[PDB]
Amino acid sequence: IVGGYTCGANTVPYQVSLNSGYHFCGGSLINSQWVVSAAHCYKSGIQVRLGEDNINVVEGNEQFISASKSIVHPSYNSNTLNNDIMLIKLKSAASLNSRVASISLPTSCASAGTQCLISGWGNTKSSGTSYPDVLKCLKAPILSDSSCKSAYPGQITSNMFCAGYLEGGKDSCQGDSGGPVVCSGKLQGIVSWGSGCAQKNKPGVYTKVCNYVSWIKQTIASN
Numbered sequence: 001i002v003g004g005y006t007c008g009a010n011t012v013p014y015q016v017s018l019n020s021g022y023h024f025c026g027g028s029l030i031n032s033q034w035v036v037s038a039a040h041c042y043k044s045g046i047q048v049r050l051g052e053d054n055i056n057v058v059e060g061n062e063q064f065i066s067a068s069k070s071i072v073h074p075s076y077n078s079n080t081l082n083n084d085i086m087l088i089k090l091k092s093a094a095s096l097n098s099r100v101a102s103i104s105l106p107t108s109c110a111s112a113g114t115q116c117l118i119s120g121w122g123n124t125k126s127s128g129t130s131y132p133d134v135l136k137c138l139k140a141p142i143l144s145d146s147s148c149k150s151a152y153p154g155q156i157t158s159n160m161f162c163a164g165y166l167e168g169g170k171d172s173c174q175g176d177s178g179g180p181v182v183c184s185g186k187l188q189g190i191v192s193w194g195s196g197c198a199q200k201n202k203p204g205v206y207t208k209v210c211n212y213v214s215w216i217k218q219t220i221a222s223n
């Protein structure tokens with residue numbers, strides 16, 4: 001997260017870190033046994049780390065649980081990042097409490113102008129590299145479909161929305177991928193892609209979660 005703020009420990013209780021020896025992507029806990037992340041975060045050997053603030057210090061609220069199964073969206077295209085969503089089932093159920101909690105799925109899509117909270121352990125510089133140990137946050141609005149398409153000609157599908165600031169300076173970044181965009185208490189987006197980070201006229205691009213709720217629910221019901 002570029003241009004954000006320190007969230008505060010365990011204030012984003014649905015935020016997870018995906019670990020394969022190291023933090024490599026975010027995710028969102030959607031019930032005691034399932035995480036939503038970005039398909040471009042897929043790899044084998046995932047440990048899901050819940051209840052994290054400092055990802056380099058054991059602070060006392062962590063739950064570390066191996067993935068038992070990963071399910072990349074059937075229609076994920078890694079070239080276009082269309083359908084950039086995956087589900088991860090945990091080998092055991094998380095213990096849910098105030099610091100480790102699921103985030104509600106949307107019943108309806110969000111609209112341009114709604115403010116949302118984007119979070120993660122990704123890069124904090126736009127012309128630099130610095131990776132934080134503690135969770136970072138950014139409040140940002142959803143942008144219009146037309147401004148999104150104008151920023152990224154020929155690239156925005158019906159499964160993508162933009163959020164952030166066209167002026168630059170405030171965005172998600174490398175290492176935030178797979179993490180949440182939460183708007184009025186609902187998971188509306190997944191950190192997906194963008195040209196650089198926090199560049200002028202290059203807002204963040206997010207997977208549009210509301211398009212996937214039917215797939216999420218049926219997948220959970222049969223797995």
Ligand SMILES: [Ca+2]
Pocket residue numbers: 052053054055056057058059062
């Ligand atoms: Ca920790």
